[PDB]
Amino acid sequence: LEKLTWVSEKKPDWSNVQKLIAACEATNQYTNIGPIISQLESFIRDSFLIEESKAVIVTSNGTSALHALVGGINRQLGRELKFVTQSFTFPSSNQGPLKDSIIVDIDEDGGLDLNAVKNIEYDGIIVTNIHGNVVDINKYVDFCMNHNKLLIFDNAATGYTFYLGKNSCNYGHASIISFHHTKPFGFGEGGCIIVDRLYENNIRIGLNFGLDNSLGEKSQYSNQASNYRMCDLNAAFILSYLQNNYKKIINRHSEIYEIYKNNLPKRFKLFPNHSKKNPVCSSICLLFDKPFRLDKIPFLSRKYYKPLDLSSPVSLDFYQRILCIPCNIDLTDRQIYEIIGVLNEFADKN
Amino acid sequence: KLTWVSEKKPDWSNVQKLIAACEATNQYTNIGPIISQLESFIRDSFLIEESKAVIVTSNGTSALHALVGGINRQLGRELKFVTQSFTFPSSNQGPLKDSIIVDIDEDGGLDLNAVKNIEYDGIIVTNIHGNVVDINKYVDFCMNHNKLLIFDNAATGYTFYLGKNSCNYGHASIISFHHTKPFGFGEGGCIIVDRLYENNIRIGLNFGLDNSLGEKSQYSNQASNYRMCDLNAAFILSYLQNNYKKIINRHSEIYEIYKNNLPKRFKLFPNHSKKNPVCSSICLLFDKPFRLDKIPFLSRKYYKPLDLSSPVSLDFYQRILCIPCNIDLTDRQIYEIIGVLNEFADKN
């Protein structure tokens, strides 16, 4: 267990990366949507099973995926949209165009508490599918349909979990994924928006300051936009990593979830998850039955997410009870069983 | 035939040797082993002063936004900046989405007359395409009125003012390493900033999360993901190692030809430097408004005013011609351009 790493060891396939970036070299186009962007967006669409009704839009990072998604929709609708995010999530959904988002608690199933938005003025909600686990997506889709609200899934850590027969990224108006090095599908930095086609053109123009190349000299910036595009260099490293490893990651991460599911240590439960098939997790998240401190676990382990608003009791209860265990393609079954042994010993003494 | 930028190709051997450091530790972002190498290269090669931090970011826009976000976090409020209309949209986006837009004066920078009766914390002055404003008039004004001063040097990485890189003036400046810039490769940015703000700006590239506080780290709503990936750092560092000297020298030599052979009724963009600027494009001003589609070679007008009601900014936009300036251009091509522009002056 001294050998545990958070992330599998990742190295460029240099001959493959050079083959991809040769198309940049040929045209001197390495950004502003060069020849690699379409290849990675196509690879994501076909490999992650994104539906035809959705755009696949790569961005510089998972954060810029969320911010470009919101910026683009704000520009299309002509106002700064007010979003609610859950406290039990990463800071990205209270930053950029979401810097004044309303923060509310989660319910005990891991997602934003729809009861907390009863008396609030807002335009949409952002629901986080934690570390590859999914919430009961239909209850958010129905709520947002009934109340004419936009629905975004923060799928930063959740690229290939299936809910009722399709990739969870295909639900709500939009979802985002992260290709940050720390993520299963990540290499360096990167993000992706999966979004209803109605907003696709404004979101793409929104990566380029709001400047529509189709208008030529008549293009006009939007104060809702920024520089949010993915560089073709980064697209090549991410595409090469996925071409060489995507299949092994989806299979092994499912195999790793399978061992914990069938061999749960005493007084630990799996994090709430609504997928029939095993999720593809960024870490294996267990909930101990009472608060505990990370320093009592003698192997590499973390707590996510530190609540954005400390006045959210369910979020804090989860933070206090969660254990996030490394989940990557370098982990051995021997290590998984030894981890389950250590948590059984921890359970005995606490 | 003309191109906006020079053909740029990775030195694969050198890029691989740099990224070998990432491969040995599996660290390719969150400040891997290349970031300090690029920031040191910039410090030494661009002649940044010891009183300044060099902070690499994902792009020139994120350099500006991370600079503002970091200072907002340190001062505990959302700072109100004024920017000039004759600039790129970055200074009216992100934390600057509600910046105040005023006109330029005829020397190419923010008109200090326009801010007399306005409430604001700071100004952003754009040094256009490698040309510099009268930097000390801004430095003195901001000292007298206790205002923050930022130079948008996105296109102005190596223009000197009173003996030192123009990036060393104001509280801070930013540079772009966008592929379209002389020093660029792919995407990238850099903040040059007073050390007082260095720590909060570096933490603000990481959502405001200070890895020094361990589990006590607390995010800022003024921050984001603004860091430069080590992969990009390697491609930018390799390109600068192999080319920065050739670029500075050839861009100066290109400017020399235009300065000494100005086409009729064209003037050099206002430049307060006593040395030739290192330009992202050669910016000429015609004596009257004209349409780009009358120029029969690759050319642009930067910048379309952010506020089209700023009359000097709109006049500059209507009269400007931005001509390619890169190390692939031959002297023969430059004299051909000046020939076509003499013909344009005759016909217009």
Ligand SMILES: Cc1cn([C@H]2C[C@H](O)[C@@H](COP(=O)(O)OP(=O)(O)O)O2)c(=O)[nH]c1=O
């Ligand atoms: C982004 C990029 C642009 N260019 C060229 C294309 C154009 O002639 C010129 C300007 O590109 P452009 O995309 O117009 O930049 P902007 O919209 O900010 O003006 O640079 C390249 O050669 N390579 C690249 O990677």
Ligand SMILES: Cc1cn([C@H]2C[C@H](O)[C@@H](COP(=O)(O)OP(=O)(O)O)O2)c(=O)[nH]c1=O
């Ligand atoms: C950024 C990065 C992190 N890591 C490892 C270091 C840590 O053990 C783990 C998490 O990184 P960390 O920097 O803590 O990210 P976060 O703030 O999202 O938790 O990933 C890599 O192995 N490679 C990388 O390029």
Ligand SMILES: Cc1ncc(COP(=O)(O)O)c(CN)c1O
């Ligand atoms: C839930 C969530 N949302 C957004 C992000 C931001 O992704 P990136 O790090 O690629 O900006 C993260 C990554 N920490 C995340 O975990």
Ligand SMILES: Cc1ncc(COP(=O)(O)O)c(CN)c1O
């Ligand atoms: C003056 C100015 N400011 C900021 C930027 C933004 O830099 P980047 O394209 O690297 O985001 C640019 C790029 N055109 C610029 O010209």
Ligand SMILES: [Cl-]
């Ligand atoms: Cl000078």
